[PDB]
């Protein structure tokens, strides 16, 4: 479904 | 409060004077909200996730009331699949994982 | 244990015999692990995040020990930029968000 992983700003 | 994870950990937040529903996301370094207007200057940025990167607008030092707790920090706005409250703000409200 | 969010909440997990580091992700419905040649039957699936969707292989009833706490459930394998523990397993180990 939804796997909202978020890295560092780029 | 203590929030279990049988359902998505969504809470109401206050930002720019407006109310919104956001997801407490320990897997996000930053906070990203769906397209919206926010006061002040912003800088073009990019952030990545499982599907790759997206372009966002970066607003700094933005006050956000999260489920009753106050935070003031960076808020990214862009085509995120959902309003996400990241660690940058989760740490400010003293949020931790426990088991 | 209590995990603060100053840094990414990475913990050691045991799966398919191997030991690896994975992100405790409250913003993920499912568990996704970086590509690994696990044995057994699987079903094709598409999971999304920021940036878009990726194709993954779904394995059911897979044992996963999280920081010593035993769990067992569906594990997705594919081109994810990080090993991710989703709510499907976090609920099994009694993980909560607290502030």
Q: What is the CATH number of the domain that holds B63?
A: 2.40.70.10
Q: B98 is written with which tokens?
A: 């426990």
| Beta pairing partners, B17 | none
Judging by DSSP bridges, how do beta strands C2-4 and B96-98 pair with one another?
antiparallel
A6 vs B82: CB contact, 8 Å cut-off? no
Rounded to a whole number, what is the distance in angstroms from the first to the last CA of chain A?
25
B29 vs C8: CB contact, 8 Å cut-off? yes
* Cβ neighbours for B37, distance < 8 A, ≥ 6 positions apart: B16
Q: How many CA atoms lie within 13 A of B34 on its CB side?
A: 8
Total number of domains in chain B: 1
- Any C CB within 8 A of B90 CB: yes
Cβ atoms B43, B58 nearer than 8 A: yes
Three-class secondary structure of residue C51 per DSSP:
coil
Q: How many CB atoms lie within 10 A of CB B32?
A: 31
Residue C22 Cα to chain centre, angstroms? 7
Q: What is the CA radius of gyration of chain B?
A: 13
For this PDB entry, the determination method is X-ray
* Cβ neighbours for C98, distance < 8 A, ≥ 6 positions apart: B1, B2, B3, B95, B96, B97, B98
Nearest to A5 among B28, B46, B82 (CB): B28
> What are the residue ranges of helices labelled H in C1-99?
87-90
A4 vs B25: CB contact, 8 Å cut-off? yes
Nearest to C27 among B23, B54, B93 (CB): B23
Breaks in chain B (C to N > 2.5 A) come right after: none
DSSP letters, chain B, are: -EE-SSS--EEEEEETTEEEEEEE-TTBSS-EE-S---SS-EEEEEEEETTEEEEEEEEEEEEEEETTEEEEEEEEESS-SS-EE-HHHHTTTT-EEE-
The CA distance from B63 to B30, in Å, is 14
Resolution, angstroms, 1 dp: 2.0
The CA distance from B22 to B9, in Å, is 8
- Any C CB within 8 A of A10 CB: no
Q: How many CB atoms lie within 10 A of CB C93?
A: 18
Residue C2, domain extent? 1-99
- Any A CB within 8 A of B83 CB: no
């Amino acid at each position: 479904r939804q796997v909202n992983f978020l890295g560092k700003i780029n | 409060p203590q929030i279990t994870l049988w359902k998505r950990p969504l809470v109401t937040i206050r930002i720019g004077g407006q109310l919104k529903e956001a997801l407490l996301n320990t897997g996000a370094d930053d906070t990203v909200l769906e397209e919206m207007n926010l006061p002040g200057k912003w800088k073009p940025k990019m952030i990545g996730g499982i599907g790759g990167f997206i372009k966002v607008r970066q607003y700094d030092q933005i006050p956000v009331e999260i489920c009753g707790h106050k935070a003031i920090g960076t808020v990214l706005v862009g085509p995120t699949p959902a309003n996400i409250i990241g660690r940058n703000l989760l740490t400010q409200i003293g949020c931790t994982l426990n088991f």
